[PDB]
Paper text:
The non-structural protein 1 (NS1) is secreted from the infected cell and is thought to be associated with disease severity besides its proven usefulness for differential diagnoses. NS1 can be found intracellularly, where it is essential for virus replication, docked on lipid rafts of the cell surface membrane, and abundantly secreted into the bloodstream of infected individuals during the febrile phase. NS1 is comprised of three distinct domains, an N-terminal hydrophobic β-roll dimerization domain (residues 1–29) formed by the intertwining of two protomers, an α/β-wing domain (residues 38–151) that extends out from the central β-ladder domain (residues 181–352) giving the dimer a distinct crossed shape. Here, we present high-resolution cryoEM structures of ZIKV recombinant secreted NS1 (rsNS1) and its complexes with three human monoclonal antibodies (AA12, EB9, GB5), as well as evidence for ZIKV infection-derived secreted NS1 (isNS1) binding to High Density Lipoprotein (HDL).
The cryoEM maps of ZIKV rsNS1 in complex with human monoclonal antibodies (AA12, EB9, and GB5) were obtained at 3.1 Å, 2.8 Å, and 3.8 Å resolution, respectively. ZIKV rsNS1 was incubated with Fab AA12, EB9, or GB5. In addition, anti-Fab nanobody (AfNb), which binds to and increases the rigidity of the elbow linker between the variable and constant domains of the Fab LC, was added to aid in structure determination. Both the heavy and light chains of Fabs AA12, EB9, and GB5 bind similarly to the surface of the ZIKV rsNS1 wing and β-ladder connector subdomain region with an observable weak density for AfNb. The binding epitopes of Fab AA12, EB9, and GB5 were mapped to the wing (residues R99-R103, E146) and connector subdomains (residues D174–L177), which are generally poorly conserved sites. ZIKV rsNS1 remained tetrameric in all three cases, as seen in the 2D and 3D class averages, but the map density of one dimer was much weaker. This is indicative of a greater motion range of the dimer than ZIKV rsNS1 alone, as shown for the Fab EB9 data, with up to 28.2o rotation observed. Fabs AA12 and EB9 datasets showed distinct classes of up to the theoretical maximum of four Fab molecules bound to the NS1 tetramer. Subtracting the poorly resolved dimer region made a bigger improvement that led to the final reported maps for AA12 and EB9 structures. AA12 and EB9 were then shown to have in vivo and Fcγ-dependent protection against lethal challenges of ZIKV MR766 and PRVABC59 strains in Stat2−/− mice.
Numbering used by the authors:
A (entry chain F), E (entry chain E): 1 to 352
B (entry chain G), H (entry chain H): 2 to 52, 52A, 53 to 82, 82A, 82B, 82C, 83 to 100, 100A, ...
C (entry chain A), G (entry chain C): 1 to 215
D (entry chain B), F (entry chain D): 1 to 228
The structure:
């Protein structure tokens, strides 16, 4: 991998050979084709799932939902052409993305139809039917979560990813709980390190010891980060990981900060979230031993938009931990209001 | 804590009678009520026990089938239904309450009893 | 923290053809990763239900599970003679994988009084420096029973061990044997030994006692 | 293909020792499925211990955290558990179970299990004391008598009456572990009172590990003239 | 950090940010021109080390040895300005670079005046005396190993827009046993990863699970690799690390291969070394339970230059491990000849 | 400032309990130096427990691997050792030490130590038995006599003769732990034979934990007429 | 495996002004990371020498060390009264770090008067069901002494425990007490109880015995 | 298996003497040998002990510092070098041999003895 780079703190410049990790989260990627195997086989799997009482699917990540949306119509066309009476409905996804107990099957053979959908870009209608294969959406009361699928896809290749941007997928044959490794990359160089995937970008630094620096998340998955793609795993207790192990947090010393316990009650209902160790505008934090115990995350602004100025914590290390979202600022559990009725506070929606 | 039986009287053979034991000063939902009878010049023989809800009731072999016992936690009383009375059933029915929550048979209190006789 | 699974009841009694209800509760939301296992004496568990509503291949249609979140239930439409066993509920959401305490399913049976017997320690055992007195309960139902040791009208505690046999195959009763072990010197210092038995089918406690020196 | 799991490597060991358990597999490959170890102590429920993922990660229960180690041999198609610093508290039956292929997270296939005994005591023979019938063991024309077997190790012992002639009314209670590290059990029989003075009752106690065979005659005590 | 990437495996020309780690091992010889900061203080440190009873130095890495061999002159010149009578003699290195018990002091205050160093970096004139402060060389008898120093320097800053970037070293203040972290880099991307430093380049990939791929060695250190710069440290026993922990091997699953134990008696005396999992030319490796027990590594050619064609092992996975050196091709400890006696072959020297 | 290491947190605990020791360093920061724990069992050598590097890396000895966990706090300048699943073998005196840098990796400065005892026995009082002198306890006109203190717990016990009047020739043997979990020691005194029949010897045994005080008079056995 | 350390001799005795040398060892090459500590009874170890030849600040000049390869040595030129203690060598090369067994320094002033005694079990102890037989060796040297318990001419093994006191501060004597524990039933089965003391101070084994039931 | 002591005689206080014992019928190299003494009308106390090579030697308080021991496996003979003899050393120095290989002090074979007296 011949390449080059330019420093920003300095002007050191060079090409050469090495290994290069790229940040694709804030860049927002670009248009992806997301070839979901052969739509013929996807149709066969969809039919086979219905025969065994499988209602819908729950998207692990935002890529899966977009792939479903982009292949919706042609799948319906294939179903209509062959002897099938079923409809697929796709809807907006919400966070956090919960785990489904079912897994889509792998058909032994393929539907007897004219296989013309390989590479078909939507733009086709089908006959509506009473029975529908709902994908996410708000189709919950129609069928509860216990009859949904989850994490059944496995990235196959990146054929012509530079310009055609084709991500090839497949249906896996293994039950698993870990996130897809084919899109994970982490590196350390001197006094800086980073863990990243298509939705997570986490940065760590050494200051008297390795610690968490900053994180930017556009999705909240529920798989678990594999160990092989993690730095310095041993010697840490899961009670201390800032990003919960249940929300796909790495098992690392780099994922820790001293004076803070694991954040399992944060505002994980948002769409875009940034973790920053800083005070938000108009707020201050003091350290006192008489402050309250841990509680749900509270927004810095009242429902009407008023701001609470004074907050206290017990045994936290400055700068304080906070979450940044388009709604406003959310503090961690360790920090509690110094003087404020709990009625005006917007409590984080506990995720279960 | 007071036990008061009622609903006892002469009945012809084959008839039906239904007793009642008004309990006070205690929550019978957390305990078990048991029925005992003592004929004149005889011992005190087990009749039936009504455990808490969801546990069922156990009946003596002699009174098997004909008798039936039920509870009303709302009214704090135990109801016994009798079917196909016989002359041998003539006796004083003394109610009992099992103090032990594990149902060890640690009876502590008894009622005054009621006189019931069967004769055509 | 680990996930705790509380089964109830500890045991229930039913006949052939009734409806049995078993509940399993979890300390935290676990989605629907719940399983049910059936274990017979001297055998490995067996796999019945997954996902809290799905039936494994080969499981008879009688069994059916329901519930979501924390509260889950298991039901049998028509109890059969071959359904006598213990039932465990397990959660597979995350490590560590915890099990339930288990529930014993038994046949209904009528109340029978316990016969009480007491045996003074043998002379040969006294020669060794230890004395053991045996109290016996035979062919009684239900299994719940209490045995208390008194020496010279003094209650004994922490000095007795009890063994309970399995439900009889013919009359479906139980037997209980409690053994009290005392040193030779301690045994000779007392005169009256008594075993008190409390049971549902006995109106008043039954006491069997002997005097050291009387045959 | 037929699917099985077969354990091996159990036996008797002293405190502070070490041992290795082998769980073979057939009909499938252990590399592509999660594998775990589960155990059941005598007279208790089930207990999970450790798991190894198909990717290679491993997790352990606190009760064995650091003392045990799980590994698999991808070439020999075997699952191993290495045990060190053993104690008598680790006595139990141990199983290896397969993570279900498609049916959620469930132990689809179990094994038969192996018994592991951790004890320092050495083999010893039983002592038999007759439970002579008396007026304190009589109820409604029925007399209770038996034999008390004490201080024997290891299991098992077979107790029979009159060389198996007497079977009705025989109740052989389960053994119990005494604080001394030796087992004990009691056997009783109920017979008519009128048969004590005419019929003879002998209990046959056998202990193959110690090669001890004792015939003890249980008869009413001499001072008890009631049965004479 | 703007990017520059042309991946020939997939032919994707990207341009973004991230973190880049380069392979600098293959061009090590003259990558820097040091001038360790303030040689007027290094002179005082050497003088005090001589006074205290510290009579020599054993180099930790080839970089330090070249620093000595480049600053030898001006240092002697500074000695010949205040009356000090000592002569620094710098020799050649030998592998492995053993460890020294003592540490170089940190002078309390610099020399009274040593500005003669200003303007005279390389071309200087000095004198000679009888006292020697020997660096390296076949000179143990003049200063016994129990009085040599070792591992006394840290890199403060480095990196410049020049073929030879100036490095600002300093004298370490605290005792330590681990290698300097400021020049270590490692990363993982999909199915490939690498650990590296200025003299180590090690590669691993995924096959079933992660394993060692290859390594390139130009020096054999004796410091310990820090945990923070290691991937997946949990669950590995130190008896399976292919590169011994004492020879600066990392504690990782990536540093393991199935069927081989630790290589404590490999041909660690050569100048530079490369590790490959392939046959030595003209030879084959068998697997046989009857083969011999572990032992010292043997060279594939006799001292007379004849080749040995057959080798065996008991439980090793093919292809076999081997060492490529300037002398020739060697086989691992587990691998022994089948029929020819081992006494005829060349045995490697003992290291501990 | 003076380099002092001060330890606290020891005591008595039952098998299977948990404890947490604190080693407070002074005059220097625990962050830059390597730190370690060392223990010494009664009457035994020295054993190394664990170490934590200045970089945060930690290592443990096998015998305590998993159960123990070493950690440090930089705000309070403290070194911690967490203990779980304690056995009886874990009773010893524990030390923390500094890893001297200017001294080639030497245990430069130590602490005063602290005692940890793991036992479930409850407080009990001693029983005093007299070692009456006899013809078998006399040699060359010198008579050997003593008192036996048995079945007591915990330490210590003080024994004196004649309320401290008699001190010469007195040997108080060290206490020894018995299999039952209790201690026993012997105290003997040598006196002239001719003084047995005229001088009175009484041993005072005191044991605070049991609040027991026993004064036992040792005299020749009545059947021993040689001393009358 | 770990690298193992060793020391010799286990203990030695010398007067003031003598020269004493002690040898430590390592099982494999450790370069020269070897240390020495001195531990007086009831105190923490003290640090003397490092690097196998370097003297810590404050140590008396009479201490010096040397060694090469797998063998190392410590030496004292002129023994001083305040140099009585135990000595340990220790590594610092790689984990796990190890110590040596130790070596005890002894004073040179011992066997004032050997004495042998035997005490039959008291009747009070018999009433409890246990019997202890005591054999006493008073004022003897050296500590190497063998006591064999003989009952009815039968040798005893595995039923006795021994305790040894510290060096006497006046005459440098040593006292050894061996206790034989038997059950009361066992104690009545034998008639002659004897303890045999085999010590260098005794040319032939001195046997002291008592007869059960005899005064 | 015979031991014969030699080299004993009168020596003035402060003198020097060297005892020698010639062992026969046994290999002393594989065993340990000890020296003993007995004054007239006195018991038989310690003199010294010579253990196998590499194990060192132990000496008694009275004899230590003054006496010195050395074995000769090749000639199967042991020598005691006495320095600064005293009148209290007057006794018959009696050789002994230890049968047990573990140095348990089990003495089974002995010599005749030799008279040694110290007087100016
Ligand atoms: C970072 O570094 C130094 C020591 O490395 C420490 O004193 C300083 O306070 C640290 N900074 C922060 C913001 O914690
Ligand atoms: C792993 O490596 C071997 C040897 O190169 C190769 O034959 C094999 O296909 C690879 N993959 C697997 C799954 O074994």
């Amino acid at each position: 991998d011949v390449g080059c780079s330019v420093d920003f703190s300095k002007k050191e410049t060079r090409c050469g050979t090495g290994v290069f990790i790229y940040n694709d989260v804030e860049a927002w990627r670009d248009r992806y084709k997301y070839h979901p195997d052969s739509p013929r086989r996807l149709a066969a799997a969809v039919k086979q799932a219905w025969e065994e009482g499988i209602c819908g699917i729950s998207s692990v990540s935002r890529m899966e939902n977009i792939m479903w949306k982009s292949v919706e119509g042609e799948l319906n066309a294939i179903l209509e052409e062959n002897g099938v009476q079923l409809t697929v409905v796709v809807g907006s996804v919400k966070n956090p993305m919960w785990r489904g107990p079912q897994r889509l099957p792998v058909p032994v053979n393929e539907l007897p139809h004219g296989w013309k959908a390989w590479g078909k870009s939507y733009f086709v209608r089908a006959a509506k039917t009473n029975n529908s294969f709902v994908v996410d959406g708000d189709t919950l009361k129609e069928c509860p979560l216990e009859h949904r699928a989850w994490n059944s896809f496995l990235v196959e290749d990146h054929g012509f990813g530079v310009f055609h941007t084709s991500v090839w997928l497949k249906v896996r044959e293994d039950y698993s709980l870990e996130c897809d490794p084919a899109v994970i990359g982490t590196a350390v160089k001197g006094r800086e390190a980073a863990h990243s995937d298509l939705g997570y970008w986490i940065e760590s630094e050494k200051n008297d010891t390795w610690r968490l620096k900053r994180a930017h998340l556009i999705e909240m998955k529920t798989c678990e980060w594999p160990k092989s793609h993690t730095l310095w795993t041993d010697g840490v207790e899961e009670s201390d990981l800032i990003i919960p192990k249940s929300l796909a947090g790495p098992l690392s010393h780099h994922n820790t900060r001293e004076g803070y316990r694991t954040q399992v009650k944060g505002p994980w209902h948002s769409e875009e979230l940034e973790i920053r160790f800083e005070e938000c505008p108009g707020t201050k934090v003091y350290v006192e031993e008489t402050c309250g115990t841990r509680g749900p995350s509270l927004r810095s602004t009242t429902a009407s938009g008023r701001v609470i100025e004074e907050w206290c914590c017990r045994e936290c290390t400055m700068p304080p931990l906070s979450f940044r979202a388009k709604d406003g600022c959310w503090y961690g559990m360790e920090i509690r209001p110094r003087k404020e009725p709990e009625s005006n506070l917007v409590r984080s929606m506990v995720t279960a | 804590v007071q036990l008061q039986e009622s609903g006892g009287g002469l009945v012809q053979p084959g008839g039906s009678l239904r007793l009642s034991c008004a309990a006070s000063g205690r929550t019978i939902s957390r305990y078990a009520m048991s029925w005992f009878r003592q004929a004149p010049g005889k011992e005190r023989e087990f009749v039936a026990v009504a455990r808490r809800s969801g546990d069922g009731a156990f009946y003596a072999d002699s009174v098997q089938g004909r008798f039936t016992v039920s509870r009303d936690d709302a009214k704090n009383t135990v109801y016994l239904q009798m079917n196909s009375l016989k002359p041998e059933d003539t006796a004083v029915y003394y109610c009992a309450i099992d103090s032990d929550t594990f149902y060890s048979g640690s009876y502590d209190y008894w009622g005054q009893g009621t006189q019931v006789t069967v004769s055509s | 923290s680990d996930i705790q699974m509380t089964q109830s009841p500890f045991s229930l009694s039913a006949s052939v053809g009734d409806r049995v209800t078993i509940t399993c509760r979890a300390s935290q939301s676990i989605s629907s990763h719940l399983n049910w296992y059936q274990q017979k004496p001297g055998k490995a568990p067996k796999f019945l239900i997954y996902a809290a509503s799905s039936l494994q291949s080969g499981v008879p249609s009688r069994f059916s599970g329901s519930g979501s979140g924390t509260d889950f239930t298991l039901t049998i439409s028509s109890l059969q003679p071959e359904d006598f066993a213990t039932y465990y509920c397990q959660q597979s959401y995350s490590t560590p994988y915890t099990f339930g305490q288990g529930t014993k399913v038994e046949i209904k049976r009528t109340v029978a009084a316990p016969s009480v017997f007491i045996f003074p320690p043998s002379d040969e055992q006294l020669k060794s420096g230890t004395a053991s007195v045996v109290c016996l309960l035979n062919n009684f139902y239900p299994r719940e029973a209490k045995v208390q040791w008194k020496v010279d009208n003094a209650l004994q505690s922490g000095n007795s061990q009890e063994s309970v046999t399995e439900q009889d195959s013919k009359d479906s009763t139980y037997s209980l044997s409690s053994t009290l072990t005392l040193s030779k010197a301690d045994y000779e210092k007392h005169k009256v030994y008594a075993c008190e038995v409390t049971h549902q089918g006995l109106s008043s406690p039954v006491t069997k006692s002997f005097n050291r020196g009387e045959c | 293909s037929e699917v099985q799991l077969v354990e091996s490597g159990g036996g008797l060991i002293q405190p502070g020792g070490s041992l290795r358990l082998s769980c073979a597999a057939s009909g499938f490959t252990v590399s592509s499925n999660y594998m775990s170890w589960v155990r059941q102590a005598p007279g208790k429920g089930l207990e999970w211990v450790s798991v190894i993922y198909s990717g290679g990660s491993t997790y352990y229960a606190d009760s064995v955290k650091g003392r045990f180690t799980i590994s698999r041999d991808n070439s020999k198609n075997t699952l191993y558990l290495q045990m060190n610093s053993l104690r008598a508290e680790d006595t139990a039956v141990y199983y290896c179970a397969r993570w279900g292929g498609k049916r959620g997270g469930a132990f689809d296939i179990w094994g038969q299990g192996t018994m592991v005994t951790v004890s320092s005591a050495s083999t010893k023979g039983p002592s038999v004391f007759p439970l002579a019938p008396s007026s304190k063991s009589t109820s409604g024309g029925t007399a209770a008598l038996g034999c008390l077997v004490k201080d024997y190790f290891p299991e098992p012992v077979t107790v029979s009456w009159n060389s198996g002639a007497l079977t009705s009314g025989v109740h052989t209670f389960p053994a119990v572990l005494q604080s001394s590290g030796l087992y004990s059990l009691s056997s009783v029989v109920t017979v008519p009172s009128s048969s004590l003075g005419t019929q003879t009752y002998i209990c046959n106690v056998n202990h193959k590990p110690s090669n001890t065979k004792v015939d003890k005659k249980v008869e009413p005590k001499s001072c008890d003239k009631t049965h004479t």
